[PDB]
Amino acid sequence: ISGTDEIRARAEQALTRCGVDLTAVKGDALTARTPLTGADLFGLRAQTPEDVDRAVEAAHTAFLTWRTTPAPVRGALVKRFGELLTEHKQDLADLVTIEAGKIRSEALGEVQEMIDICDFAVGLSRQLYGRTMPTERPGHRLMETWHPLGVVGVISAFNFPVAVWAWNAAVALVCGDTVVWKPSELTPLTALACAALLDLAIADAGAPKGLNQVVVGAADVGERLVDSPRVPLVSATGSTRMGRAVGPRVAARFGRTILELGGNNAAVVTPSADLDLTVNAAVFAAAGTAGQRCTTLRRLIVHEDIADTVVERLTAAFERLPIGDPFQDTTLVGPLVNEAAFGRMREAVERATAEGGTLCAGGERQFPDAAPGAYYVRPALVRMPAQTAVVREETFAPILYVLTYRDLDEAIRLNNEVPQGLSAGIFTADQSEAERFLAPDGADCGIANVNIGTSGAEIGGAFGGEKETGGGRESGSDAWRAYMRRATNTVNYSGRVTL
Amino acid sequence: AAISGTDEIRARAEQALTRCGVDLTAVKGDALTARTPLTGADLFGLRAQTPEDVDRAVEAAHTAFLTWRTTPAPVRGALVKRFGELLTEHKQDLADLVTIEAGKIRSEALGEVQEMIDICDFAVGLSRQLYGRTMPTERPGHRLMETWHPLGVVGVISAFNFPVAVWAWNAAVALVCGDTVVWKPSELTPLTALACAALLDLAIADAGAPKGLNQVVVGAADVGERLVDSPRVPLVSATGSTRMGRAVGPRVAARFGRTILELGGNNAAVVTPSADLDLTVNAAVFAAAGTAGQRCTTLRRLIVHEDIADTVVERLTAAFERLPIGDPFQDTTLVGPLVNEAAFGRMREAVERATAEGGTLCAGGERQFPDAAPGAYYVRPALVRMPAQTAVVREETFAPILYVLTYRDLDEAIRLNNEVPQGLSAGIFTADQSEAERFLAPDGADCGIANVNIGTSGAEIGGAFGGEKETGGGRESGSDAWRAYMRRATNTVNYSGRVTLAQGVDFS
Amino acid sequence: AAISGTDEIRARAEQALTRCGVDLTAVKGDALTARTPLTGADLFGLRAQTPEDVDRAVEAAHTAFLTWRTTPAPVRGALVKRFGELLTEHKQDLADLVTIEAGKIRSEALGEVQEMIDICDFAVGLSRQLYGRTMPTERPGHRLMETWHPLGVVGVISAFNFPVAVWAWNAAVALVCGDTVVWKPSELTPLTALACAALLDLAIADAGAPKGLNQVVVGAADVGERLVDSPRVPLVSATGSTRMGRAVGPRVAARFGRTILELGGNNAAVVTPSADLDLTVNAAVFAAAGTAGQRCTTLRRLIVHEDIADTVVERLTAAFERLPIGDPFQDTTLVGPLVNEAAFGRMREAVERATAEGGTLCAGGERQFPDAAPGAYYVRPALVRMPAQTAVVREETFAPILYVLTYRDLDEAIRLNNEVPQGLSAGIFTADQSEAERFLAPDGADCGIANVNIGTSGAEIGGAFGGEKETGGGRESGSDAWRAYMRRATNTVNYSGRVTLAQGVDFS
Amino acid sequence: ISGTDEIRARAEQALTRCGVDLTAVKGDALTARTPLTGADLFGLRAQTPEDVDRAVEAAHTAFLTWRTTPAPVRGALVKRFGELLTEHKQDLADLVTIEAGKIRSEALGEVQEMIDICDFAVGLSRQLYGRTMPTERPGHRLMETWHPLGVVGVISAFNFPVAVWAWNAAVALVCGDTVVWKPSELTPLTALACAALLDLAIADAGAPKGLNQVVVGAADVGERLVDSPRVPLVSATGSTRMGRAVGPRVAARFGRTILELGGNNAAVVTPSADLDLTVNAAVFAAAGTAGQRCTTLRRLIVHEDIADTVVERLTAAFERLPIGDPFQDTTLVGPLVNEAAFGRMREAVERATAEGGTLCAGGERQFPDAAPGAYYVRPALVRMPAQTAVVREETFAPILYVLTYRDLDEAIRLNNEVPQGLSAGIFTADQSEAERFLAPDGADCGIANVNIGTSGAEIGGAFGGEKETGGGRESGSDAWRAYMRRATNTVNYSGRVTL
Ligand SMILES: O=C(O)c1ccccn1
Ligand SMILES: O=C(O)c1ccccn1
Ligand SMILES: O=C(O)c1ccccn1
């Protein structure tokens, strides 16, 4: 396993290359850390709640200029940012691996997501389409226009520490908004590097300095951002608890929220499923990112006629998964984020067996003496007699519960029964089963796929889910509309009014 | 003036209800009462639903939804078409009930029923659209699309002032979107809702549609609160005063539900030096005094350039003095009564406070013929010239009070428009091309509706209706407002038989 | 079988025309004749328009357009709503005329009239949409939008086989788009057009709309040609055989006009090894034999996997032998007559040539009860097994002939589908998820309509209807097909008071 | 004036820098030329009609691969092309000035149009939106999809020798089409440079070589392209004669055309017009590019109450226009393209005075001895008593006809009376007049603007016009739909059919 001194030097190098002034951000209030060894990297300055208020003030002042800057000019800034991200892709990806623990190929993919949404937002900057339409009034004209909203508060999580902010910031900036970003306390360095690169693009563009600001600190900092009367939109990604904080209190001040609170995602495996395809897809979606994606596969609903062979094949695969240092290309499963994540995983597996389940593979901590402060775990495969309490309540860990069904409508009911609703997949060769799964009475999730897993999503699609996932959408399609305000304009050019 | 008697109003209400298919014996009772602002009197008592009845109604609506959501949308549109035909057939009867319960003049009552018919026609068109998207995917041998699906039971909370059109907007759209509806009408206007529901129930019977597609729950606040709190109601659409917002918005958010909120406006019009004054005075009177100042879109603030402020006030003063106030069934009437005594009280307190904050009462504000209908509150709309936009101006009163403010620079007029906490509609009267465009620009008026040379009530079925800030953010009726009634799904379909292998490893 | 007599048909036609408001005395004459495929006989003579009359009709339609184009689209929609109500009222009468002139069975005639009603409902929705766009501009202090405007007079050329629905698609959409219409119906089906126009003229009178919004011109080819050549007709919508294409397309292009061309299809269905054979045989019979093979969307080629080809042919042979052929007014009839003797002649020549090109006639092809109605051509649909897709298979005959081809690899079936010069509709019958998606993929079926587990007539109001290659490229009815009836404008609005100075020089 | 030897060396340098192999393209069949001096630069190889057939075959073979290449991957090629255009912007702009004669600032702007449509097309590559919509059939699903069309024939003109092709090629390539480009015989070098840069992007992307090909030659080459049965779309830009060739014969083989055949564009000047704004706007739109834009202002319809002062101000401005070498930054008006252009201009002015008009300014050839083979002319200002034959028939030269009106509806009628219909503008301070001009009974053109001239257009808008302009649209909004084919798909998953 990579040494902590080596990791710290890599982090400082990447930060410096991305334009971070290490002397200016170091301090004693917070500590950067790495799940690779569990070690603290170095101390950081923190922001206070008054700092948040000052940051919102600076973002709002920037917004007053940015909102009348033509959207194609705002797109030119985002185009330049994408060029800088391309130039520093490896440096940023190193920070993503160091702080989030994800393997390098996934860290590079996450940085590429940033570049791709930049390119998409540059296209959007000439669109942001409203409508023109007839009016019933003679000698009048009617249209619908879209306008910049204001300061956007972005709350992101540890597991996608750069892509979620990029989704929000690339779209928000092209929409004429400004951004105040509160990253996860677990992943501040990625955010500092992102912000420094964007500040460089802002300088090159001659744009206002307050277009984007990062606030580093604990829960009190994020609370102050959520409560700000000058933040009309809060975009929050995290686990379910973040909804009951953020949603209601922003609603209480008549603000808007985009909430994406994770999922408890299932795939249905029908009798005609290609089992090699299904096993590969399930392994990648259940074990990838050590089960720490919003879209992670956590429930496999398998037809009773193939359930035994599917569990046998998955058991063999799970026993073969390469666990290790996420900087090694041979690794598929890196570490969990911290000790509490490991403890919660162990507690879920213990509860599952007490609720009648059978642990088929995985669950054991790997090479603890190689890094006693880090938690490398083999993903767990648990066969369950029913969708019990532990199955319905998501644990943010690599645990794949296997359930059986006979009738497709019951598989759909099992998919839909849980409180979350992010993504779902069906593996089938049957044309009708595929369509039934995607029909109005099929899977109820925001993402519903055929013959690809629960992480099957891309930039051009709206990303998000239903029920306790929170209802928000980000990235593609017309998700941008949540960052602007609609106006309906009637124009009288006839000189008369009804008497 | 001569005001209809309560007994004459009751007889007309009962005739209208019977013609619309309501069983008077079944809906009458002793728990609540129907009433009329025309005299302030109770008409007759009504049976009420309990909170338990609300839960039963929601569960029955959900059962109906389980069938309706797989009924093809064009077939769902056929039901709405049939309902529109019944509304057309009973337009006069329903308009009678709107005048009786809301107090609005006959022509406005007819226009509100026509709004229902028009949104039915619009929703029938939508029933073949409800467009999602197909789009490229980056993955070879895959397809990508976005689809829209029926959401579930929609709870509709409506207000006294548009007792049929708001529900119609929500129900016509929700039904073609595959949703079902539980409607809590205003405690002040139950009869209009009973008549609407009876006509829709006839359409449902004619169509062979599920019986639980729409239900009216008649009750007080505990009935409405139970509807808002139901875990089986994924969307609550609420129209009412600002206080409905902090109620409904956070509560529904707390259970991961969706809301559409339209909580009224404090709407302003800017009058520039080049304004056509005949056009402007007519538009301002209609928008300030119409519906006795009880529209969400009512004109409450007039922001007039200092060069023409004196002549505009003179003309408005004369016009307000000529307003015909009386029984809303008489064709001569332009201004009917306020809804109840509490509305009159709040109006008088606002006018008194405006004069204490430095304002000058230019016209109106007095109760008319109080002895002719002692329980009813007919008032002349008030015109108040204000030296600044003080607290009483920024706090909207649901009453016909028009505050006149002066400005010099257009950016000051825009700031005056935007400074209030509401944000429903705004208008600018100008002959100047650049001023009109500046008012509508991103740094212009901040409202959900922003118009040129038409007042703050200038809106129509085809546009999205709603506003910003404390108005609540929701949109109803036109454009793609229907998307709030459905859930988006993003679908990736793999037909390649292959998946990307993580780290190149094949686990098979 | 028992076939209605010409005199009984004429009496029913005259009753239907009178009920729809046609003045029989005014339209009768000696220039042309109405006829019926049920017996092949002339019904009665009609007055005809001259080419000069066409120019007069176009100029009158243009005068109407000058008023209609500034009539608000929702008001234009109200006219179309009224027309839909009259169509609903006279559905049976109009369907009688469709059966009499086109020869299609009662249920199909009723369905075609219902298509008219449905597109009216759709167009009423469109009348509040006709959406353009608003979008950012790169220029500070400017605004940018895209608007859609009424185009002008639309010339509609329709065919005998859908004598009312095609005009309805064009007219309902054109009218709400602010256009006016001059309609040249098939020389074979004038009475349906006279009845439609009389009902629309009543709607126009009820609405107080301009009288020249729609006119029917009754004539031969010189009347149609004058319409196509008119410099006052910016859009010609033409439905007919392939030969209508090289006529209309280039001529209208030569005067910088626009065309919508839908020139029929040579439509195929692929039957894969996993196809549900009961579903497939029923769908194939309905799509091949329905309307006596005289739909633009008729199934003419069946591309069947070699593993199931023998059993599919056996089942189709038995089904074709059981088809009930007879008078289309009898409820027992599924297959009515071909339109005329020339259609029968071309069918016999194609079947004879197919057997000479190596094919095997499996069922049908014979004229039924020739002595019962000697001037009418009732035929049993032909089923022909072909060893290859030879010339006669690639050249479509407007007759019920189903050619059966075999394949092994799906890419071969797709090539067989795509190899013909027409490109209207295609279908695949399969239980396999990947085959269904492959058929619809960019390298799949090349047609304008491509379906899974539904035949080649699987289309509906909400979709754009039309095809590719020699089908002609046009789209009608649903989605945003309406844009072909309007002109796009891109509007930049400067409110900044400034312009970019070329080379920085201020010439003022 | 720049010397021919200097110009030739600049052209060869720019070509080489853009990757052109000078030995491979030089020949004896055609000659490159420059309007700066009228001189021939050097000889070029030409293609034969069989070469066109071979090029179409190669483009079609490329199309069979490109049409299943995911559109976002096709967008990555266009993104790379835009980067190469940015890198070689000055080199390409030099070739545009040398061949088209336009001043360097306009040549740079035209190359920037290419870069901007590349960025827009990269956004489109994740959109290309069809629809999903309800079906009336129980247990069915309905959608509308868009598919690559095939080989696109592009015919461009001398006056925008790179931007028009870029509009067509960036959109076509993202739409999965391939391109065969026949540039103007007058401007082959720009096309060779564009094609070489795109071939470099294709090589970097690993894309098929036949995605884009240039065919250099005379009318027989373009005719063979237009007639090809494997070219389903022809996009043609040029003067009106190109419509009656291209439109009807492509229609005769059931192909599709996009036609943009220029304009006879007018601006209305109302009594409340800002006259400083109007004079500047009119001078730029009438005299820019020496009157050789499709969007050039050719008709000024001025209210009678201000007509005298507007003509006086325009006369003064026209007398002050800087005519000269388009490589000199002081130049506003460069040369006309060739002697025939000058002759046609002179003939139009002579006809205008015979039809009752008064030449107020301009029309004289400038410094002929400085370059006897080049035609530098001062733009002509002609006051006309009515919209006579010469006013209604466009001459591709800087001639601005001044007409008077009193009632706005008559100004609109004068605007609309001509056979072309590309662009129109109104200069007014009056809110109602502005809206009346843009209303359904207002200006009939494809582009209709307020307080900006007839060249007021940009990437995000659909570009094109009505009537004899030809009806086509290019560039923005959903112009891309003309490059693809619509499919309507009904999917039955219920297992049943109506009996
Ligand atoms: O305030 C208004 O103008 C309004 C409110 C609801 C429904 C219709 N109109
Ligand atoms: O061929 C068809 O199926 C068709 C043609 C025109 C109108 C309706 N249907
Ligand atoms: O005439 C114009 O302004 C034009 C023409 C083609 C491309 C860009 N601009």
PDB file of C-alpha atoms in Angstrom, chain A residues 67-68 103 105 131 133-137 140 142 144 147-148 240 243-244 247-248 251-252 254 256 261 276-277 279-281 283-284 317 320-321 329 331-332 438-441 443-452 456-458 460-462 466-468 473 477-478 485-492 495-497 499, chain B residues 69-70 133 135-139 142 144-146 149-151 242 245-246 249-250 253-256 258 263 276 279 282-283 440-443 445-454 457-460 462-464 468-470 472 475 479-480 483 487-494 497-499 501-503 505-508:
ATOM      1  CA  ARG A  67     -26.562  37.848 -15.230  1.00  0.00           C
ATOM      2  CA  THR A  68     -26.339  40.464 -18.009  1.00  0.00           C
ATOM      3  CA  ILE A 103      -9.254   3.540  -8.316  1.00  0.00           C
ATOM      4  CA  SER A 105      -9.430   4.677 -13.827  1.00  0.00           C
ATOM      5  CA  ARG A 131     -40.854  29.432 -26.249  1.00  0.00           C
ATOM      6  CA  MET A 133     -46.489  30.845 -28.896  1.00  0.00           C
ATOM      7  CA  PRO A 134     -49.764  32.381 -30.068  1.00  0.00           C
ATOM      8  CA  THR A 135     -51.863  34.596 -27.864  1.00  0.00           C
ATOM      9  CA  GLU A 136     -55.659  34.669 -27.913  1.00  0.00           C
ATOM     10  CA  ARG A 137     -55.501  38.498 -27.903  1.00  0.00           C
ATOM     11  CA  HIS A 140     -50.531  40.991 -28.937  1.00  0.00           C
ATOM     12  CA  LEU A 142     -46.707  35.996 -26.196  1.00  0.00           C
ATOM     13  CA  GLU A 144     -41.764  32.491 -22.397  1.00  0.00           C
ATOM     14  CA  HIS A 147     -33.509  34.336 -16.755  1.00  0.00           C
ATOM     15  CA  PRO A 148     -30.547  33.880 -14.397  1.00  0.00           C
ATOM     16  CA  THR A 240     -30.964  10.497   2.951  1.00  0.00           C
ATOM     17  CA  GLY A 243     -33.076  15.767   2.599  1.00  0.00           C
ATOM     18  CA  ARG A 244     -34.833  16.439   5.898  1.00  0.00           C
ATOM     19  CA  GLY A 247     -35.462  20.429   1.669  1.00  0.00           C
ATOM     20  CA  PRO A 248     -37.889  21.679   4.338  1.00  0.00           C
ATOM     21  CA  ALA A 251     -38.808  25.511   1.300  1.00  0.00           C
ATOM     22  CA  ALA A 252     -39.626  27.506   4.453  1.00  0.00           C
ATOM     23  CA  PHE A 254     -39.406  29.974  -0.479  1.00  0.00           C
ATOM     24  CA  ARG A 256     -35.665  25.951  -4.520  1.00  0.00           C
ATOM     25  CA  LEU A 261     -29.819  11.587  -1.876  1.00  0.00           C
ATOM     26  CA  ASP A 276     -22.090 -13.838 -18.498  1.00  0.00           C
ATOM     27  CA  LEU A 277     -23.289 -10.295 -19.263  1.00  0.00           C
ATOM     28  CA  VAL A 279     -22.503 -11.425 -13.809  1.00  0.00           C
ATOM     29  CA  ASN A 280     -20.060  -8.897 -15.245  1.00  0.00           C
ATOM     30  CA  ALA A 281     -22.585  -6.059 -15.022  1.00  0.00           C
ATOM     31  CA  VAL A 283     -19.988  -7.295 -10.208  1.00  0.00           C
ATOM     32  CA  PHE A 284     -19.048  -3.877 -11.636  1.00  0.00           C
ATOM     33  CA  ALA A 317     -16.623 -13.709  -8.945  1.00  0.00           C
ATOM     34  CA  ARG A 320     -11.895 -13.321  -7.146  1.00  0.00           C
ATOM     35  CA  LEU A 321     -12.297  -9.535  -6.818  1.00  0.00           C
ATOM     36  CA  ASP A 329      -4.020  -0.692 -12.015  1.00  0.00           C
ATOM     37  CA  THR A 331      -7.077  -3.067  -8.213  1.00  0.00           C
ATOM     38  CA  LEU A 332     -10.838  -3.159  -8.749  1.00  0.00           C
ATOM     39  CA  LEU A 438     -39.776   0.525 -18.414  1.00  0.00           C
ATOM     40  CA  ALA A 439     -43.575   0.999 -18.680  1.00  0.00           C
ATOM     41  CA  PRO A 440     -45.615   3.349 -16.426  1.00  0.00           C
ATOM     42  CA  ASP A 441     -46.427   0.402 -14.141  1.00  0.00           C
ATOM     43  CA  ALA A 443     -39.806   0.253 -12.304  1.00  0.00           C
ATOM     44  CA  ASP A 444     -40.543   3.526 -10.494  1.00  0.00           C
ATOM     45  CA  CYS A 445     -36.984   4.929 -10.470  1.00  0.00           C
ATOM     46  CA  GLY A 446     -35.520   8.042 -12.059  1.00  0.00           C
ATOM     47  CA  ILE A 447     -33.173   5.834 -14.116  1.00  0.00           C
ATOM     48  CA  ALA A 448     -34.474   2.554 -15.542  1.00  0.00           C
ATOM     49  CA  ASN A 449     -32.272   0.516 -17.873  1.00  0.00           C
ATOM     50  CA  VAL A 450     -32.258  -2.664 -19.997  1.00  0.00           C
ATOM     51  CA  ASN A 451     -29.210  -5.013 -20.044  1.00  0.00           C
ATOM     52  CA  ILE A 452     -26.950  -2.474 -18.326  1.00  0.00           C
ATOM     53  CA  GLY A 456     -25.752   3.181 -16.491  1.00  0.00           C
ATOM     54  CA  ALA A 457     -26.077   6.929 -16.992  1.00  0.00           C
ATOM     55  CA  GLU A 458     -24.318   9.634 -18.985  1.00  0.00           C
ATOM     56  CA  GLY A 460     -26.765  13.854 -21.934  1.00  0.00           C
ATOM     57  CA  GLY A 461     -29.367  12.377 -19.579  1.00  0.00           C
ATOM     58  CA  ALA A 462     -31.031  14.027 -16.612  1.00  0.00           C
ATOM     59  CA  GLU A 466     -37.684   9.699  -7.013  1.00  0.00           C
ATOM     60  CA  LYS A 467     -39.170   9.100  -3.557  1.00  0.00           C
ATOM     61  CA  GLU A 468     -36.541   9.528  -0.803  1.00  0.00           C
ATOM     62  CA  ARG A 473     -32.282  16.247 -11.669  1.00  0.00           C
ATOM     63  CA  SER A 477     -31.634  17.004 -20.944  1.00  0.00           C
ATOM     64  CA  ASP A 478     -33.236  20.236 -19.676  1.00  0.00           C
ATOM     65  CA  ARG A 485     -36.484  31.405 -13.574  1.00  0.00           C
ATOM     66  CA  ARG A 486     -39.284  31.273 -16.120  1.00  0.00           C
ATOM     67  CA  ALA A 487     -41.054  34.457 -17.204  1.00  0.00           C
ATOM     68  CA  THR A 488     -44.257  34.586 -19.253  1.00  0.00           C
ATOM     69  CA  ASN A 489     -44.392  37.793 -21.326  1.00  0.00           C
ATOM     70  CA  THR A 490     -47.469  39.212 -23.066  1.00  0.00           C
ATOM     71  CA  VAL A 491     -46.753  42.244 -25.282  1.00  0.00           C
ATOM     72  CA  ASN A 492     -49.571  44.486 -26.513  1.00  0.00           C
ATOM     73  CA  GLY A 495     -52.796  50.232 -28.290  1.00  0.00           C
ATOM     74  CA  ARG A 496     -56.058  48.919 -26.843  1.00  0.00           C
ATOM     75  CA  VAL A 497     -57.409  47.080 -23.788  1.00  0.00           C
ATOM     76  CA  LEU A 499     -63.373  47.452 -21.730  1.00  0.00           C
TER      77      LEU A 499
ATOM     78  CA  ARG B  69     -51.943   5.215 -15.165  1.00  0.00           C
ATOM     79  CA  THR B  70     -52.012   2.409 -17.767  1.00  0.00           C
ATOM     80  CA  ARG B 133     -36.978  12.954 -25.613  1.00  0.00           C
ATOM     81  CA  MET B 135     -31.197  11.355 -27.811  1.00  0.00           C
ATOM     82  CA  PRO B 136     -27.823   9.825 -28.697  1.00  0.00           C
ATOM     83  CA  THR B 137     -25.899   7.744 -26.227  1.00  0.00           C
ATOM     84  CA  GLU B 138     -22.114   7.611 -26.054  1.00  0.00           C
ATOM     85  CA  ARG B 139     -22.306   3.802 -25.752  1.00  0.00           C
ATOM     86  CA  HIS B 142     -27.199   1.291 -26.938  1.00  0.00           C
ATOM     87  CA  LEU B 144     -31.124   6.442 -24.756  1.00  0.00           C
ATOM     88  CA  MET B 145     -34.444   8.142 -24.107  1.00  0.00           C
ATOM     89  CA  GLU B 146     -36.354  10.155 -21.531  1.00  0.00           C
ATOM     90  CA  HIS B 149     -44.911   8.638 -16.348  1.00  0.00           C
ATOM     91  CA  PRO B 150     -48.031   9.241 -14.248  1.00  0.00           C
ATOM     92  CA  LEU B 151     -47.142  10.371 -10.732  1.00  0.00           C
ATOM     93  CA  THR B 242     -48.769  33.696   1.646  1.00  0.00           C
ATOM     94  CA  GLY B 245     -46.712  28.609   1.797  1.00  0.00           C
ATOM     95  CA  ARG B 246     -44.925  28.072   5.107  1.00  0.00           C
ATOM     96  CA  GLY B 249     -44.170  23.837   1.263  1.00  0.00           C
ATOM     97  CA  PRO B 250     -42.017  22.650   4.168  1.00  0.00           C
ATOM     98  CA  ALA B 253     -40.868  18.717   1.465  1.00  0.00           C
ATOM     99  CA  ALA B 254     -40.413  16.987   4.832  1.00  0.00           C
ATOM    100  CA  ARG B 255     -41.985  13.805   3.390  1.00  0.00           C
ATOM    101  CA  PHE B 256     -40.159  14.053   0.020  1.00  0.00           C
ATOM    102  CA  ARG B 258     -43.585  17.806  -4.553  1.00  0.00           C
ATOM    103  CA  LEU B 263     -49.575  32.280  -3.155  1.00  0.00           C
ATOM    104  CA  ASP B 276     -50.777  56.051 -23.763  1.00  0.00           C
ATOM    105  CA  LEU B 279     -54.945  52.861 -22.478  1.00  0.00           C
ATOM    106  CA  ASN B 282     -58.446  51.885 -18.444  1.00  0.00           C
ATOM    107  CA  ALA B 283     -56.011  49.008 -17.896  1.00  0.00           C
ATOM    108  CA  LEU B 440     -38.481  42.329 -19.633  1.00  0.00           C
ATOM    109  CA  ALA B 441     -34.683  41.857 -19.586  1.00  0.00           C
ATOM    110  CA  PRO B 442     -32.833  39.683 -17.027  1.00  0.00           C
ATOM    111  CA  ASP B 443     -32.152  42.762 -14.863  1.00  0.00           C
ATOM    112  CA  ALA B 445     -38.913  42.993 -13.557  1.00  0.00           C
ATOM    113  CA  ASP B 446     -38.301  39.846 -11.475  1.00  0.00           C
ATOM    114  CA  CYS B 447     -41.831  38.430 -11.645  1.00  0.00           C
ATOM    115  CA  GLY B 448     -43.185  35.226 -13.151  1.00  0.00           C
ATOM    116  CA  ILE B 449     -45.359  37.297 -15.511  1.00  0.00           C
ATOM    117  CA  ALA B 450     -43.966  40.480 -17.074  1.00  0.00           C
ATOM    118  CA  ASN B 451     -46.059  42.321 -19.645  1.00  0.00           C
ATOM    119  CA  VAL B 452     -45.895  45.348 -21.948  1.00  0.00           C
ATOM    120  CA  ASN B 453     -48.938  47.650 -22.398  1.00  0.00           C
ATOM    121  CA  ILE B 454     -51.254  45.167 -20.685  1.00  0.00           C
ATOM    122  CA  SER B 457     -53.927  40.189 -15.000  1.00  0.00           C
ATOM    123  CA  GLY B 458     -52.648  39.727 -18.572  1.00  0.00           C
ATOM    124  CA  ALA B 459     -52.273  35.953 -18.733  1.00  0.00           C
ATOM    125  CA  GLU B 460     -53.904  33.127 -20.674  1.00  0.00           C
ATOM    126  CA  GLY B 462     -51.311  28.802 -23.144  1.00  0.00           C
ATOM    127  CA  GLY B 463     -48.801  30.407 -20.775  1.00  0.00           C
ATOM    128  CA  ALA B 464     -47.346  28.975 -17.593  1.00  0.00           C
ATOM    129  CA  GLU B 468     -41.343  33.907  -7.908  1.00  0.00           C
ATOM    130  CA  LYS B 469     -40.131  34.763  -4.375  1.00  0.00           C
ATOM    131  CA  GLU B 470     -42.956  34.493  -1.787  1.00  0.00           C
ATOM    132  CA  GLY B 472     -43.998  30.287  -4.260  1.00  0.00           C
ATOM    133  CA  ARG B 475     -46.439  27.040 -12.495  1.00  0.00           C
ATOM    134  CA  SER B 479     -46.453  25.687 -21.684  1.00  0.00           C
ATOM    135  CA  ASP B 480     -44.907  22.554 -20.138  1.00  0.00           C
ATOM    136  CA  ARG B 483     -44.273  18.126 -16.240  1.00  0.00           C
ATOM    137  CA  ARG B 487     -42.146  11.784 -13.151  1.00  0.00           C
ATOM    138  CA  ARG B 488     -39.185  11.768 -15.520  1.00  0.00           C
ATOM    139  CA  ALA B 489     -37.367   8.523 -16.304  1.00  0.00           C
ATOM    140  CA  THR B 490     -34.035   8.274 -18.127  1.00  0.00           C
ATOM    141  CA  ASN B 491     -33.746   4.927 -19.938  1.00  0.00           C
ATOM    142  CA  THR B 492     -30.569   3.381 -21.335  1.00  0.00           C
ATOM    143  CA  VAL B 493     -31.256   0.302 -23.456  1.00  0.00           C
ATOM    144  CA  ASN B 494     -28.375  -2.027 -24.306  1.00  0.00           C
ATOM    145  CA  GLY B 497     -25.108  -8.057 -25.696  1.00  0.00           C
ATOM    146  CA  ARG B 498     -21.967  -6.672 -24.048  1.00  0.00           C
ATOM    147  CA  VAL B 499     -20.910  -4.555 -21.072  1.00  0.00           C
ATOM    148  CA  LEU B 501     -15.440  -4.848 -18.381  1.00  0.00           C
ATOM    149  CA  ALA B 502     -14.103  -3.166 -15.255  1.00  0.00           C
ATOM    150  CA  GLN B 503     -10.299  -3.016 -15.505  1.00  0.00           C
ATOM    151  CA  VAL B 505     -11.506  -8.296 -16.329  1.00  0.00           C
ATOM    152  CA  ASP B 506     -14.102 -10.817 -17.541  1.00  0.00           C
ATOM    153  CA  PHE B 507     -15.616 -12.499 -14.478  1.00  0.00           C
ATOM    154  CA  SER B 508     -17.294 -15.229 -16.542  1.00  0.00           C
TER     155      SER B 508
END
